[PDB]
């Protein structure tokens, strides 16, 4: 359920050109917001 | 060209409604929360009455403020009778209790999308009409199960054939736990104590040749599969028990989709009757019973009264539900940063459903047959 | 071309309504597009109800399918032949009729 | 053919078919008539007529209803010989086998 | 072409500000949906 996603803390966006919802995680957002190999979180 | 395209399409009919018509609505205010509460009162003598105020007539507290309760046993009532001596110091000290009923309202909805290309270059030019007809009909269908699922789940009167007590107990392996004529009359007897009133009056009898007279009964909703078992059902006198509908059609009025009557029940067949599929016992050597999905399939027999289904409508104007549709046709209406061309459409159906099951004395008896 | 093709539209909630346009209440893409199926079993169908929430969005997507029906037409015939000598010299004079 | 076997067609076929062509015949003021339910014309070869005639209901009574037992009550179909359960029996000279 | 994305079993998310279109992958989304080091695939 979508509320479980929000209650967990993860956000969500809308996939327009085919698909449903992808859910943004905290690490993923940091992973997603990386320019070079020295801007992504430590784990990855 | 290799074939001729016939225009008229084959469209499936909509399953006739059978449960939504029997419910009554209770309006729920907007500005306040999403729950409705009730205070059901119980009789003093009923065993449901539990209370701390219980001082014995000739003595101290005994933690029983219901006198003899509902014992109905001649070996008990005289002892617990409120006998009083000449000196009226203390007595039974009866108490009273009220029951809290809670009802919830949930949200459900649909949506589907289509591109302009699909509507334009399609073999059939009536695609839009077929989609909306199929969509709204399904919303009508889904609403029905919402009601029926709750009614099946909530039923105080749940009789089990034979010596069974739970769904897992039922099996067709040995002596198949099936509906007996003895079982059906007891459900009426249990229903005869109170709640469910007599849906219909007794049939006096009309001047004919084959017509028979039936007693006042209450509608019992049954799946199509179990109908055969009710048909070939021997009475105590080895005669028929399933009085056919035709044998009292002339005399009394008829309820929709009627097949017949047993004792204090008029049989009603519903095409869309949910069942406990694959919830019985493991089918090791299933003796040709249609009830087989991994395990034996359990079928219900439902008899709804007239005070056991309070459907709560949030803003529904005297209806079990309203459907709220939203059509965004492809074109300018759907032009945005996402699609700056507008080659997308959207239709969504939203609704609000909730039930209460007040006075839960509906009858739901199981059966594993066919 | 001796073939008549028809179009039968299945109901939405039938198991024949297999379509890829399926999104669940969690926003993911599911396989079964005909939600809740045709299965009249209350052991599963409560789970697959179109439960929306206050948030709303791209959840509970459904599709629609249609089926083709094709006919056919065949030729059939027969004949008989008689000789002149049969009719004139026959005992009956209404044999032709 | 068996009585439950015949009605097992009816219940399944009731779950889909076209309605009961004929209506439900009510009771008449006569002295020998019976009452038959709504039926759909069943077509049968004359060879099986005897089998239906000496047909036993589950309660060891007569199952076939001779058509004259509801002649005055309702309307008779062409070639009708009688009715069984939810089927009015229609005999056809040219039925196959 | 955008149709080639869907043919690859791939969904795509639009960008409001300056991207136009960002293609979103199921491994990426599963990577992207992650609170901490626990919820990333064995490949990472």
Author numbering:
A (entry chain M), E (entry chain O): 5 to 48
B (entry chain G): 18 to 387
C (entry chain E): 50 to 146
D (entry chain E): 196 to 292
Authors' account:
We isolated and characterized two Shigella podophages that have notably different features when compared with classical podophages and instead are most closely related to phage N4. We describe the isolation and characterization of phages Moo19 and B2, including whole-genome sequencing and analysis, cryo–electron microscopy (cryo-EM) structure determination, mass spectrometry, host range studies, and enzymatic assays of the tail proteins. Our work shows that these phages have divergent decoration proteins and unique tail structures, and encode and package their own phage-dependent RNA polymerase, and the tails, which display esterase activity, are dependent on specific O-antigen modifications of lipopolysaccharide (LPS) for entry. Moo19 and B2 are similar to bacteriophage N4—these are all T = 9 podophages, which encapsidate their own polymerases—a hallmark of this phage family.
We also analyzed the data by imposing icosahedral symmetry to visualize the capsids at high resolution (3.6 and 3.4 Å for Moo19 and B2, respectively). Both capsids have a T = 9 geometry. The major capsid protein of each has the HK97-like fold that is present in most, if not all, dsDNA tailed phages. Using DALI, both the major capsid proteins of Moo19 and B2 are most similar to Ralstonia phage GP4 (37), another T = 9 podophage with an RMSD (root mean square deviation) of 3.0 and 3.2 Å, respectively. The decoration proteins of both Moo19 and B2 bind the capsid proteins at the same quasi-sixfold symmetry axes in both phages but have notably different folds. By contrast, B2’s decoration protein (gp45) is only 99 amino acids. It also forms a homotrimer but is quite unlike Hoc or gp28. To our knowledge, there are no reported phage structures that have structural homology to B2’s gp45. However, B2’s gp45 had poor alignment with these helical decoration proteins and did not share a recognizable topology.
